[PDB]
């Protein structure tokens, strides 16, 4: 019991360090900077190909080939410039929660509600796409998949663990066990050296794939968090929660840096992503729309209402040309 008391002493110590030796004053490091007024973005293309509610969005480094899966078990690979389709990959584990896209452009990741992270091959000979490996080893459900390279892959599985594999072996080469809840979201760094994961414990942790021990733990919410994304500087990450609060956490500061909320939103997040400069934050609420926050002033810059049902995932290009709000109304938009 005294070991629990010493654990509470350590928690009080890491709260006293980020309380006394941290002097944020970030109503003053943002009143000097000018706002962005109000940004106006319109639906350039309505990618209309699914027949069910979708759950995933990730674009490649080409900024054209986005992947998107839905309830019907038909993840299709779109084309951002020409509205066309290039692949309609059939799959078995139809209750898909998430997808990803390899930075080389060769693979996609799938993953459903039945503990199977399927990775597919695209740039292959011998015809169509082909199920390369069947990554398993969890107990709960896959929630967010991401690629490091064509060799390695990290995920975020509902049985409290995050995992780093090797694809050609399929065994969990590194586990990540630090939570007491279901890790709902997962995001990577621009150098892909260290990632961050958000769970049901109202806490987002920063893991590193070198060793496997979580380096810092970031709390501050009141409920589950459903969207994590690193800032493009690689030194901050935005957490959306079910408390209508997409607060921005700072790694070097090591506390909650600032909080983003509004009065008449008592609603829930589903997806959060930055631009390529991070002045604006694409918070995808469940108010059948998504908002665009001026991410260094905690002010709203835009309202991208273009749907009829709640958005689920929201990807931004690697070169900052578009966002892709994908709603449960099956008609994922591309804004600009």
């Amino acid at each position: 019991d005294q070991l629990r008391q010493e654990a509470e002493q350590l928690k009080n110590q890491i709260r006293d360090a980020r309380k006394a030796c941290a002097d944020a004053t970030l109503s003053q490091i943002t009143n000097n900077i000018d706002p962005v007024g109000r940004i106006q973005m319109r639906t350039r293309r309505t990618l209309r190909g699914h027949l069910a509610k979708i759950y995933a969005m990730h674009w490649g480094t080409d900024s054209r080939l986005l992947v998107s899966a839905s309830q019907d078990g038909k993840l299709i690979i779109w084309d951002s410039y020409t509205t066309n389709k290039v692949h309609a990959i059939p799959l078995r584990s139809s209750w898909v929660m998430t997808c990803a896209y390899a930075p080389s452009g060769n693979y996609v990741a799938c993953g459903g509600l039945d503990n199977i992270c399927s990775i597919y091959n695209l740039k292959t000979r011998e015809g169509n796409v082909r199920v390369s490996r069947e990554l398993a080893g969890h107990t709960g459900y896959l929630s967010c998949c991401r690629f490091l390279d064509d060799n390695q892959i990290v995920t975020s599985s509902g049985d409290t663990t995050c995992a780093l594999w090797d694809i050609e072996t399929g065994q969990q080469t590194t586990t990540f066990t630090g939570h007491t809840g279901d890790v709902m979201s997962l995001s990577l760094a621009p150098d892909t050296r260290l990632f961050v994961s958000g769970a049901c414990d109202a806490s987002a942790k920063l893991w590193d794939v070198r060793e496997g021990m979580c380096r810092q733990t970031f709390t501050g919410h009141e409920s589950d968090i459903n969207a994590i994304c690193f800032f493009p500087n690689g030194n901050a990450f935005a957490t959306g929660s079910d408390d209508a609060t997409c607060r921005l956490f700072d790694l070097r500061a090591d506390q909650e840096l600032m909080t983003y909320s509004h009065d008449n939103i008592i609603c829930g997040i589903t997806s959060v992503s930055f631009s390529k400069s991070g002045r604006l934050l694409l918070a995808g609420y469940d108010d059948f729309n998504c908002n665009v926050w001026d991410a260094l002033k905690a002010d709203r810059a835009g309202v991208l209402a273009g749907h009829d049902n709640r958005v689920s995932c929201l990807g931004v290009t690697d070169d900052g040309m578009a966002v892709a709000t994908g709603s449960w109304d099956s008609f994922l938009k591309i804004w600009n």
């Binding site: 054209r64 080939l65 084309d79 020409t82 066309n84 290039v86 692949h87 740039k123 000979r125």
Partner: peptide, 10 residues
């Protein structure tokens, strides 16, 4: 024929 495909490859 699709984006990034390689036509006439066999």
């Amino acid at each position: 024929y699709y984006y990034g495909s390689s036509p006439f490859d066999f």
